[PDB]
Amino acid sequence: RRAARF
């Protein structure tokens, strides 16, 4: 969800 694979 953040910026990279999340």
Side-chain angles (χ1 to χ4, degrees):
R1 296 184 181 187
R2 306 180 178 81
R5 67 59 165 246
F6 315 120

